[PDB]
Amino acid sequence: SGAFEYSGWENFHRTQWSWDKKTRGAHLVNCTGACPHFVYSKDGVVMREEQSKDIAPMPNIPEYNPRGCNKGECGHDYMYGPHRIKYPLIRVGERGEGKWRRATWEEALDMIADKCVDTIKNHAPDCISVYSPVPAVSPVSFSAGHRFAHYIGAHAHTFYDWYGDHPTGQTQTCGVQGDTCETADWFNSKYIILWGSNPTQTRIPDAHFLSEAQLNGAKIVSISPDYNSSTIKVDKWIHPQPGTDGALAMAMAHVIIKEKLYDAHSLKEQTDLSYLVRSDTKRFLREADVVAGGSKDKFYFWNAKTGKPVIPKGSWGDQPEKKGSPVGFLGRNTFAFPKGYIDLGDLDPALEGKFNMQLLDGKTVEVRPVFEILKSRLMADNTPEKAAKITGVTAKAITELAREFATAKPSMIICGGGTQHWYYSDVLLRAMHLLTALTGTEGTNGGGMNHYIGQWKPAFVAGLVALAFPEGVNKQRFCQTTIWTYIHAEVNDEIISSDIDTEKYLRDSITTGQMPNMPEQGRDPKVFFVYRGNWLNQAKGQKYVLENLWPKLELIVDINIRMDSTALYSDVVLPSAHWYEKLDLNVTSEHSYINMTEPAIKPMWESKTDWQIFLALAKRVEMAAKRKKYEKFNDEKFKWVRDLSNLWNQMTMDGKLAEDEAAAQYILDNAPQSKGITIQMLREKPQRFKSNWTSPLKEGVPYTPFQYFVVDKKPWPTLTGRQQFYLDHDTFFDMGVELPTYKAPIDADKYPFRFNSPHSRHSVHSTFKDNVLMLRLQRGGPSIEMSPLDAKPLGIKDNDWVEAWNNHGKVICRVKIRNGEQRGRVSMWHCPELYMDLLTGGSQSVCPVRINPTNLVGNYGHLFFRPNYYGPAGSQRDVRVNVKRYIGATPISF
Amino acid sequence: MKAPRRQLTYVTDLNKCIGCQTCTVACKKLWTTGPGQDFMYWRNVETAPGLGYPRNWQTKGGGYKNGELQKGKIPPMIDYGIPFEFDYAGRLFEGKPGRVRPSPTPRSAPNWDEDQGAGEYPNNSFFYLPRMCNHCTKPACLEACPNEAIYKREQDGIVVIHQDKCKGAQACVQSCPYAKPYFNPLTNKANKCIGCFPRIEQGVAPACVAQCVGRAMHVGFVDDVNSSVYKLIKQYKVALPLHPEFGTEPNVFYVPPVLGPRIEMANGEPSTDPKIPLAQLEGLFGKQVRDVLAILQSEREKKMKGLASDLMDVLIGRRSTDMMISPLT
């Protein structure tokens, strides 16, 4: 036998850990984890999930495994819990009441198809739009509605900038959509600055690399107004005033330039800091100013080896010998140039000095290198002592941080929402990129300016585009969602136009075609498809949206696994298959591997996968287009006669992609980063990408971006062909940011607390906010935090109801008093669902939508509109509110 | 009670725990989804300083005093937290007006005081303390039970409450000073951490180890001289048990936090003292903490100089199988 005395009874627990099927799962949410999981079924019921822990390790550094998090291990609760959409639902009461009638798929989809055909016929196809964000999260489900929109002419949305995740300053500097090292590379750094980044809560499966780096001898700095959870492990904590980081950064740059701790060689080669600026007009000296038929887009540096001015190679006016195709994530395809192209060679560009030069028209003008201008402005305005006054960080601290940062090799900056979600985050990121340029660590392992926010990066992006926009992105309507929301929700930003003429800039950017305005001819938006994103709940200017934008929409359709707040406020709600009931890919910027989910069981109740829903809808649209004698129509914008009677075939390439798996394989097949990989391989184990974006993807080495420019010396896709810190466009001069410098936060809200709205460990955006187990590991509802120093004089006690408000709206939420919070601000974990434990409003009630003019510039080299490449950030960290105790309910503690 | 043949041993690296509660969730989703188990967190993670779970458990009583069994209190249900419940169906699908409030009115919960800690800005301080059954070499629960329902497994030292033998006496709840047996009021039986013995029997790490996202948990048999738990507890000696003065000889150990910033003085400049007070760590782990921190800081300093440190490499755990019994399943 061989049994211990109680082993028979112990079979009771052994039975609890058993299953008869194990499938691969993923959580298709916007967390950036893309964590490999197994899902465990017994008798056709999913019991639980567990990380599969099977990403291949790299030598000498910690593995990514297990990843996972606290939401992910209860992911199955959205299969079986009280939130699930089982059947198609049609509204019967007012929007938001949660008064429904169950309908058949047929009646639901026909109502929708009827409206869609009418809207195209009676108004314009661009009065229909589909919002579905972060394609990297679930590219097949993303492609379903975007392809639908593609073939009927409906417009799409932007997400990266709308969320404020788009590193606007990085695009301004580097001319790329964005790029960042995978998190394993953090282990290669000697000195990391966590700059508005709370990875203990907001990069949970990657956070181990930081504490492991430190135990391996790295030092880490946290910069954050409050003492945040990440901060308990760092070696040094810097707590500036909210939104004053730019002054800190510029003072660091000053110390580094003054004490000469920079990499002059790197500056001379990789940046525009040697380029020459006309003293008279304060513009770049250009070829056109010197030579008949000279280019507007070529420039000069002073070569100190020959005492003569020289035209640097690689700028916008310099064409490669054979052009490449346009690349989505670059200003222009500078990969077409050969290796070595911008190598410094024997050149020695001057960084300091003044020089005279002979203009075309006979005049002689004085020119200076950008660096010379930059340097003199920093010595005058950006001393430690002056930045000390602004930030409230001591001058000694600022100086010691500068020296450490510039001395440790490699050093890196890790920035996040704390520094990216501000009105002026663009100039702040340019300053962080200035700090990286000065230290020379860009494109090195363990170095650089690395941003992390949402699940924005689908490395296989050409395969995605192949499936979503088969006739080309140039034959696809896009709005820019921040502008769309600002205008259609008729937002009041409270910025007086004599301070910043937002209206003029915005209008002028649209009428000159720099930025889009959808619908055209001022028509109202009429039909709104929302899925894979909780658009209403997360939307800035929410109160304007609900009051002004929402009632313009004749039909609002939400496709969802659960009843979120957007769906609660919708006309038709369609049931979408859970992550563990569908097939899809799942990728992120944090690691270089392809994740996926597959069905553990068939879709529950009457749910369908997103791919199938837009397939079935396409049929009913065919049927409706015929009923309405409107089967084809002209679309003069694209010179495209559209055939609504063939929509389904269009959706599926004549039936080839009628199954989810073929659509998923289609993406994998049509991208260099993935071609070779099959679904069956992914089903077994996560596979590493075959290549990446702006650097080689090397065997056994963590990805770090921009090496194609830094190492291979291809030109940067900017106007100057370098990392460009001088942006001599009229709008940048207007805002005082032709150069990186400190821009103080917007104080248009005349209220005394700065309103912070960071991301919590307890949810993934609005998803899992309402999960019972998550709420049980908090205090049962949303939370806003205050320092005791502000709460005590307001007579506010821990867990009292508090009321926070400004001109935009009001929210009433229970308070958490936390000594780590900095006085003068309050922190409300972002976007709890509207139906949760709030007596009124939510976090977005007190947020307008605001647009910085520099984000509207679209006629300046690498600055042009492309969806999710450039456009207005949806910032929100400038918001200010008042707070008082709510006295309608004051329960006693015990 | 006769020594076990091998003793399963855990090491919790407080330098690495990010308080993400994944292990709390993994454990609950495996073993405490049953009737009457909703208020039970066999594995929990609490902010230190704080009240913990159940609140004020550290003065609940129990354990041993000069080898005499102590009979402590039975924590009332409110000290554990009445698990909040919600009527989502009413508001989302049934047209009922009004917010989906938690019931009861929130007053207490297992993680109520998350990240509050102690000290005034800019020297507020806290860290995370994961806890569980300590599968003690001298289990007070086991001795307390008038029905011998609790036994320590001979093959791996895992302590288990035999659910057929249990008659709900609650002497165990009284006498465990870590307050880790939970009286199930539906079944009239105590329930507690089972050391994931079915996983351990198949050579799979307990879920609170295998699923530890911060990569802070180690597990193994302490007799295995090549295990990270042997290395941290016996060789380098940087892993201590929680409240040794309770006299139960826990077999779960903690590496105390040495990561962390300095006390900030009124002029804005660093002290040499850490924000985490030594006195706090001494309260949890006793007078050996000082020397452990000294070793840890010393070894990290070698790493900063670019020198070798085997100890640091162990904590870093570049491969999970160097920390634990295989986590694959």
Ligand SMILES: Nc1nc2c(c(=O)[nH]1)N[C@@H](/C(S)=C(/S)[C@H](O)COP(=O)(O)OP(=O)(O)OC[C@H]1O[C@@H](n3cnc4c(=O)[nH]c(N)nc43)[C@H](O)[C@@H]1O)C=N2
């Ligand atoms: N004041 C302030 N405002 C801010 C922010 C702030 O920091 N402060 N942060 C931002 C940021 S940075 C972001 S990235 C947004 O919160 C992201 O919201 P999102 O709607 O995409 O996620 P969310 O999780 O909420 O919604 C995802 C929806 O999709 C459902 N879902 C998830 N998976 C699927 C699926 O496979 N198919 C379908 N059809 N649906 C699915 C999900 O239930 C939820 O409704 C935004 N505003």
Ligand SMILES: Nc1nc2c(c(=O)[nH]1)N[C@H]1C(S)=C(S)[C@@H](COP(=O)(O)OP(=O)(O)OC[C@H]3O[C@@H](n4cnc5c(=O)[nH]c(N)nc54)[C@H](O)[C@@H]3O)O[C@H]1N2
């Ligand atoms: N568990 C979980 N993780 C997530 C998400 C989630 O919803 N849940 N969302 C993901 C996504 S899409 C986002 S965009 C990211 C956001 O996550 P993060 O990038 O970390 O940004 P935040 O949470 O907004 O704030 C990070 C820290 O910066 C601080 N900080 C706030 N204001 C300032 C400032 O003015 N200056 C400085 N130096 N610091 C400031 C905040 O108080 C906060 O402590 O998280 C991603 N990770």
Ligand code: SF4
């Ligand atoms: S939710 Fe996001 S982070 Fe948490 S486990 Fe699933 S994928 Fe990983």
Ligand code: SF4
């Ligand atoms: S999972 Fe690991 S890291 Fe997260 S809380 Fe539990 S122990 Fe700490």
Ligand code: SF4
């Ligand atoms: S911790 Fe409490 S329950 Fe677990 S063994 Fe030690 S005494 Fe018994």
Ligand code: SF4
């Ligand atoms: S060992 Fe197993 S049972 Fe005990 S706490 Fe960890 S997961 Fe829960």
Ligand code: F3S
């Ligand atoms: S004392 Fe014994 S009888 Fe049950 S309640 Fe505790 S195991």
Ligand SMILES: O=S([O-])[O-]
């Ligand atoms: O799926 S269970 O944990 O209710």
Ligand SMILES: O=S([O-])[O-]
């Ligand atoms: O204030 S009470 O409800 O903790």
Ligand SMILES: [Mo]
């Ligand atoms: Mo985001």
Ligand code: NA
């Ligand atoms: Na739930």
Ligand SMILES: [Zn+2]
């Ligand atoms: Zn569950």
